[PDB]
Design a protein around this ligand. Structure first.
Ligand SMILES: Nc1ncnc2c1ncn2[C@@H]1O[C@H](COP(=O)(O)OP(=O)(O)OP(=O)(O)O)[C@@H](O)[C@H]1O
Ligand SMILES: Nc1ncnc2c1ncn2[C@@H]1O[C@H](COP(=O)(O)OP(=O)(O)OP(=O)(O)O)[C@@H](O)[C@H]1O
Ligand SMILES: CC(C)CCC[C@@H](C)[C@H]1CC[C@H]2[C@@H]3CC=C4C[C@@H](O)CC[C@]4(C)[C@H]3CC[C@]12C
Ligand SMILES: CC(C)CCC[C@@H](C)[C@H]1CC[C@H]2[C@@H]3CC=C4C[C@@H](O)CC[C@]4(C)[C@H]3CC[C@]12C
Ligand SMILES: CC(C)CCC[C@@H](C)[C@H]1CC[C@H]2[C@@H]3CC=C4C[C@@H](O)CC[C@]4(C)[C@H]3CC[C@]12C
Ligand SMILES: CC(C)CCC[C@@H](C)[C@H]1CC[C@H]2[C@@H]3CC=C4C[C@@H](O)CC[C@]4(C)[C@H]3CC[C@]12C
Ligand SMILES: CC(C)CCC[C@@H](C)[C@H]1CC[C@H]2[C@@H]3CC=C4C[C@@H](O)CC[C@]4(C)[C@H]3CC[C@]12C
Ligand SMILES: CC(C)CCC[C@@H](C)[C@H]1CC[C@H]2[C@@H]3CC=C4C[C@@H](O)CC[C@]4(C)[C@H]3CC[C@]12C
Ligand SMILES: CC(C)CCC[C@@H](C)[C@H]1CC[C@H]2[C@@H]3CC=C4C[C@@H](O)CC[C@]4(C)[C@H]3CC[C@]12C
Ligand SMILES: CC(C)CCC[C@@H](C)[C@H]1CC[C@H]2[C@@H]3CC=C4C[C@@H](O)CC[C@]4(C)[C@H]3CC[C@]12C
Ligand SMILES: [Mg+2]
Length: 1128
């Protein structure tokens, strides 16, 4: 209960304590004034005027006191909530970056950004101003009790006898509501994980036609969250129904008991009515604080998962400082019987006792088959996992003894398929070490041979690399990764196929630079080519995860081992949002009629009190008991009907809001899966930004469209009925009562114009924080391997500073507006007493009519606080609704959901390019293609040959129809590709990407994703697996086709996911194959087995090959050489 306030500082405790005592001082005033008011109620034309004027002095002073008490009440709670929400946001991201990679494999980490955004929003709604308004209502209730015990003590015990039942019911239903809040929250987090997985790899979802599959996977969780939110609303309104049932039933009991006392004259008329009126003010106030109770229960439910992640502790601690930092390390490295298994597949033994010995100054070279443990050996050097039954030594001393940061900073890796970050080129090379000068950057870039194209691009070292490097080619991204590793100047260099996507001349220059550089660093080389493996002093060969083969080139060539075999924004009206749920108009009708019939009843008690005071007059005393029994039956039946009407309005409004939220979330994701690749290449649209938008916009709409509308319709009916009753009984005073309406209206106008202005900047800056959070979570291998986690926490905090200041300004603006609203509501009483004195002494109205109007106005003074509490939600609801509708009304150029276009029945695999000129929209000044002419007949094989960065993957993107050419014609089988239906077009193609990526599902589903719109059978999956040469490994695994591949294929090796990408292409039986270096992480045996099945499958269809081999280019039918983006 106080774990929400576990992170409260001393200033936070001071703000919450002063806000608590000022809210206790603020609420207790209304009932306590009744003791001085109730002494003239039981009642020459000057003494009454003096009493009225004196009470006007009291009320004006009370209003002045309320002006500063309500200000401090709101402002200090909102300042404290802003400060501790800032530090919870910092500590949760620090706790995510602290954990080790064994935690990132066995847990769900695409769920964390959605969990972050939506839970911190729920906690900010929960621990803020709602708690202060709750204390205000509690102080009002107990001040009514104090007034009751001063005036008449036998009346207040009968009503105090029910308050533990109200506390019991509120605690029970708040505990149930916190449980359902956690259950609903988990479902929305699963849906956000589906969306963030689908938007991260968007090129494969577009190219394989998987929009409907991802949309159905999203809607499967939206339906569960809907069905939890409905019964959440059921419990949340059984609570208020039981509360008001107890209120009116106990008031019936107390009124029947007070009947006998007033008739037997033990009390007078004045002592009973003050007790009744003060207790009804308090009892209505505690009932209105029930939404604040529900909001606190929701925050308590959200905090469960966030606090645990902070509590969890890693065995390999990244931030700790408890290890040796020796001054001089010669690069000796040695294994001693290393046994290892990954924690996600624990029962598959991988290293079975390895004995490697690397001397300081020489390099080794790891050869072997695919899937034997080479990059596992590389991952155990930098201590990402601990081995099960072994030890790894550097210069005689164990790696478990070193400081983890010092180890990971003295060694420098190159990953297999390297991943850049979504910042500039010089920023990636600065992420390399951390404090680099430009001399170091330019020398390392020349040493990695990346200098010519960086000089060639405009804004040379400032070109924004796309998300994961997607705005660069495959041989430019890898040279930037080589330069990134070289700026560190490591003592131990790890090269895991660093030249896998470079052509032969650049491989020669890179290997000459790396060979010239070595003086005192050890190097581990995993070689793509076995022609440069001969320049190694030691060669290690893996056979079932051990070393059976070690020595020099001729030493292992005369040995007959494994190496021998290898060598041989427009605003939107809110009725436009409520135009979407036209279908449940009976829900809004029943909710609005019950809200009117519930809000009207609070001011009607003045007329009931007038009839009570008139019915206790001089009589025969046998009739007044029989009339007062009729009044008590009326209060009992009013209690039963109030139970039914409160339940109906709340449940009815809540169900309609859940339906609208489900429709808005699915419409937003369906309309986000629709835009073309230029919308995703826009630098504002990262997947972190796009996954914060789906969690913010519909949630901000739901927060103002839920049961809050039922409560505000109730409060507006309350304020209306007060004015109507006032006009009937005295029309002269009611004009002054309505005279404040211009001032409260202008204050509402000014706070709406300021809260709509700062919610804009809040929404603008939370996406820029969520971008950093998502890239640092989803590239956690490279983050941990480079030790830039301190820098990413620093960046997240300095992007998180902004909404703190926005919360400060929101606190002051909303506090001033709530303050002057409550003060100008309490000055109306002083104006009413003075002007009513004037009217009574001139003879217009009467004293009981002045009492009647005053009594009717007190309940509206209750309702204004909740209307002002609703007012800061409507601004962010309007803003997020404008953003949702501009997303819904955006229409792309290449429309993926269109049903019109030519859909020919028979397709001959003929393609033709007639002088295609194309520039990318992000860098639209550089020419990529400069008029491209190539024609491929049926059954031919086009081979694309060129240097690195010539436009070989651009033609695959143009044939896949992501992009439109500027001036040129892409035509297929005679007819132009713009005329064809784009889903038909993308279904006729079969594509293997350059660095392929998978999904976080099973191998059977990743292979069956290759052809949608039909249930692909298990026999077809097994046949494509046998053709792609993966079925021996799949049969070896303990789960055969149900081993869950990790996020983007990280729980497999390079060759295995290359091979599942080839099977995913080949399962659809395409008409044309697009193979963009389809065999680049495979060895010679696997590549020659794959190529035979590809050759027997290519009989009768066309294919386009982009492969850097002399074996697959030479047997091709056409050979195309690129120079300056043209064909030669
Ligand atoms: N994160 C992981 N979780 C579970 N198993 C894994 C993980 N990474 C790899 N494996 C498994 O470990 C075995 C060894 O794969 P490994 O990554 O060592 O291949 P490799 O021969 O080093 O080639 P590469 O250099 O492409 O990684 C594979 O069978 C793979 O299925
Ligand atoms: N999404 C993009 N936005 C802007 N420019 C891009 C984008 N993708 C690629 N480029 C640019 O296009 C040029 C060539 O792209 P492409 O990836 O087709 O070359 P490539 O021949 O595939 O290279 P490699 O053979 O090394 O894989 C590169 O200079 C690259 O900077
Ligand atoms: C008499 C009543 C109306 C006024 C009560 C005075 C209160 C509201 C004033 C007096 C002293 C003030 C504190 C003095 C010191 C600081 C440290 C500053 O870094 C944060 C604000 C904070 C914590 C102030 C908060 C407001 C404060 C506590
Ligand atoms: C700064 C504001 C918010 C604090 C509210 C202060 C409360 C506790 C004060 C404000 C007005 C005060 C009342 C003013 C008049 C009198 C009449 C006297 O015969 C009995 C006490 C009584 C009824 C006071 C009780 C205490 C009181 C209600
Ligand atoms: C009637 C008058 C004298 C009452 C005094 C008003 C005092 C209590 C209010 C008005 C201005 C307020 C300060 C305005 C600015 C901030 C900055 C914020 O980061 C810390 C709280 C702090 C410092 C507020 C503390 C409380 C404060 C000092
Ligand atoms: C929730 C609980 C605490 C509230 C229970 C309230 C009960 C005790 C009160 C509410 C209405 C009251 C009844 C109101 C009217 C009359 C009619 C009279 O001819 C007999 C007594 C009788 C029948 C009262 C008996 C006591 C009574 C039933
Ligand atoms: C729900 C809101 C909008 C309508 C409020 C009207 C009802 C609930 C209130 C307002 C005036 C009240 C009436 C005032 C006068 C009397 C005369 C008495 O001999 C019987 C009870 C009776 C008839 C009261 C019953 C309830 C009553 C009719
Ligand atoms: C008994 C008296 C005080 C009740 C007064 C009712 C007042 C508080 C309510 C009733 C209708 C409300 C207005 C309804 C419409 C809007 C448009 C909104 O974009 C700005 C606020 C504004 C202008 C509201 C201001 C506050 C308002 C005028
Ligand atoms: C809620 C606010 C806006 C209402 C305004 C309150 C003040 C300014 C109003 C309300 C009652 C009014 C007073 C009512 C009666 C009289 C007696 C008359 O012989 C002189 C004017 C005088 C004294 C009025 C002056 C203005 C007055 C004091
Ligand atoms: C603190 C600021 C916002 C207050 C602004 C409103 C002030 C100027 C107005 C509104 C209500 C007015 C009070 C209403 C009633 C009367 C009774 C009369 O016999 C003496 C003047 C007196 C007591 C008025 C004094 C001035 C007053 C308090
Ligand atoms: Mg390429």
């Amino acid at each position: 209960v106080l774990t929400l306030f576990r992170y409260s500082d001393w200033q936070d405790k001071l703000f919450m304590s002063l806000g608590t005592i000022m809210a206790i001082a603020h609420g207790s005033g209304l009932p306590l004034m009744m003791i001085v008011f109730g002494e003239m109620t039981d009642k020459p034309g000057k003494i009454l005027e003096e009493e009225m004027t004196r009470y006007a002095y009291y009320y004006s002073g009370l209003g002045a006191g309320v002006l500063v008490a309500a200000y401090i009440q709101v402002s200090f709670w909102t300042l404290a909530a802003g400060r501790q929400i800032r530090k919870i946001r910092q500590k949760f991201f620090h706790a995510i970056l602290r954990q080790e990679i064994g935690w990132f494999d066995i847990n769900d980490t695409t769920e964390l950004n959605t969990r972050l955004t939506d839970d911190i929003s729920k906690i900010s709604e929960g621990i803020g101003d709602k708690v202060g308004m709750f204390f205000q209502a509690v102080a009002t209730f107990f001040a009514g009790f104090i007034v009751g015990f001063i005036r008449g003590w036998k009346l207040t015990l009968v009503i105090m006898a029910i308050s533990p039942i109200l506390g019991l019911s509120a605690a029970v239903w708040a505990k149930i509501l916190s449980a359902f809040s956690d259950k609903e929250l988990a479902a929305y987090a699963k849906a956000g994980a589906v969306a963030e997985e689908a938007l991260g790899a968007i090129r494969t979802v577009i190219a394989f036609g998987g929009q409907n599959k991802e949309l159905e996977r999203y809607q499967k969780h939206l339906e569960n969250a809907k069905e939890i939110g409905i019964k959440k609303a059921i419990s949340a309104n059984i609570s208020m129904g039981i509360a008001f049932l107890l209120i009116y039933a106990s008031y019936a009991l107390a009124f029947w008991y007070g009947s006998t006392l007033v008739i037997s004259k033990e009390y007078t008329i004045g002592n009973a009515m003050t007790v009744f009126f003060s207790i009804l003010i308090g009892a209505f106030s505690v009932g209105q604080a029930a939404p604040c109770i529900d909001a606190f229960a929701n925050a308590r439910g959200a905090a469960y998962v966030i606090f645990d992640i902070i509590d969890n502790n890693p065995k390999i601690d990244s931030f700790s400082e408890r290890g040796h930092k020796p001054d001089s390390i010669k690069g000796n490295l040695e294994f001693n019987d290393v046994h290892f298994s990954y924690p996600s597949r624990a029962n598959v033994k991988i290293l079975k006792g390895l004995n490697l010995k690397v001397q300081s100054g020489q390099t080794v070279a790891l050869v072997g088959s695919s899937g034997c443990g080479k990059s596992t050996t590389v991952q155990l050097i930098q201590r990402l996992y601990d081995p099960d039954e072994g030890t790894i030594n550097i210069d005689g001393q164990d790696i478990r003894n070193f400081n983890v940061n010092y180890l990971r900073e003295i060694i420098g890796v190159v990953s297999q398929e390297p991943v850049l970050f979504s910042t500039t080129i010089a920023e990636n090379i600065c992420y390399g070490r951390g404090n680099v000068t430009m001399d170091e950057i330019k020398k390392a870039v020349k040493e990695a041979n990346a200098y010519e194209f960086i000089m060639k691009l405009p804004q040379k070292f400032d070109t924004l690399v796309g998300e994961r490097g997607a705005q660069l080619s495959g041989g430019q991204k890898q040279r930037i990764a080589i330069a990134r590793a070289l700026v560190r100047n490591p003592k131990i260099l790890l090269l895991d196929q660093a030249t896998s996507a470079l052509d032969t001349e650049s491989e020669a220059e890179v290997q000459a630079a790396l060979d010239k550089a070595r003086e005192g660093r050890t190097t581990i080389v995993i070689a793509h080519r076995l022609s440069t493996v001969r320049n190694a002093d030691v060669i290690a060969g893996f056979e079932d995860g051990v070393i059976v083969e070690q020595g020099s080139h001729s030493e292992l060539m005369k040995k007959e081992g494994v190496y021998f075999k290898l060598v041989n924004v427009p605003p939107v009206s809110f009725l436009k949002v409520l135009k979407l749920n036209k279908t449940e108009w009976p829900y809004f009708v029943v909710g609005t009629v019950c809200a009117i019939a519930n809000g009207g009843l609070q001011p009607a008690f003045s007329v009931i009190f007038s009839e009570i005071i008139a019915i206790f007059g001089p009589g025969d005393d046998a009739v007044k008991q029989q009339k007062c029994n009729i009044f008590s039956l009326i209060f009992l039946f009013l209690g039963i009907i109030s139970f039914f009407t409160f339940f109906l309005q709340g449940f009815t409004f809540g169900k309609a809001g859940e339906i609208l939220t489900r429709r808005l979330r699915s419409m937003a994701f369906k309309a986000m899966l629709r835009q073309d690749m230029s919308w995703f290449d826009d630098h504002k649209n990262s997947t972190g930004a796009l996954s914060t938008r789906l969690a913010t916009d519909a949630a901000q709409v739901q927060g103002a469209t839920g049961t809050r509308l039922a409560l505000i319709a109730q409060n507006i009916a309350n304020l209306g009925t007060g004015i109507i009753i006032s006009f009937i009984y005295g029309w002269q005073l009611t004009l002054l009562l309505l005279a404040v309406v211009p001032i409260i209206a202008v204050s509402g106008i000014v706070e709406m114009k300021l809260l709509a202005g700062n919610a804009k900047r809040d929404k603008k800056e939370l996406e820029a924080a969520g971008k950093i959070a998502t890239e640092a979570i989803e590239n956690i291998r490279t983050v941990v391997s480079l030790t830039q986690e301190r820098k990413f926490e620093s960046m997240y905090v300095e992007k998180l500073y902004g909404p703190y200041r926005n919360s400060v300004q929101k606190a002051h603006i909303y506090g001033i507006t709530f303050s002057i609203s409550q003060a100008f509501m309490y000055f109306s009483y002083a104006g009413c007493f003075r002007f009513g004195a004037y009217l009574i002494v001139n003879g217009h109205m009467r004293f009981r009519d002045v009492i009647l109007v005053f009594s009717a106005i007190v309940f509206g003074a209750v309702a204004l606080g909740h209307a002002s509490s609703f007012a800061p939600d409507y601004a962010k609801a309007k803003l997020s609704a404008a953003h949702l509708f501009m997303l819904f009304e955006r229409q792309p150029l290449i429309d993926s959901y269109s049903e019109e276009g030519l859909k020919p029945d028979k397709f001959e695999g003929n393609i033709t390019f007639n002088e295609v000129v194309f520039n990318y929209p992000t860098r639209a000044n550089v020419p990529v293609l400069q008029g491209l002419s190539l024609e491929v007949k049926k059954g031919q094989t086009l081979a694309l040959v060129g240097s690195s960065g010539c436009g070989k993957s651009t033609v695959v993107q143009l044939l896949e129809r992501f992009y439109d050419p500027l001036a040129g014609t892409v035509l297929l089988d005679g007819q132009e590709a713009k005329k064809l239906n784009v889903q038909w077009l993308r279904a006729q193609l079969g594509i293997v990407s350059q660095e392929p990526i998978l999904f976080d599902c099973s191998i059977a589903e990743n292979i069956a994703y290759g052809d949608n719109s039909r249930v692909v059978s298990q026999d077809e999956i097994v046949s494509a697996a046998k053709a792609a040469n993966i079925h021996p490994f799949i049969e070896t695994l303990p789960h055969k086709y149900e081993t869950r591949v990790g996020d983007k294929g990280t729980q497999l090796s390079g060759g295995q996911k290359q091979r599942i990408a080839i099977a995913r292409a080949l399962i659809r039986q395409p008409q044309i194959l697009l193979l963009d270096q389809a065999t680049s992480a495979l060895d010679t045996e696997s590549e020659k087995v794959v190529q035979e099945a590809l050759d027997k499958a290519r009989e009768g269809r066309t294919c386009i090959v982009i492969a850097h081999r002399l074996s697959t280019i030479q047997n091709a039918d056409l050979i195309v050489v690129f120079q300056n983006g043209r064909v030669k």
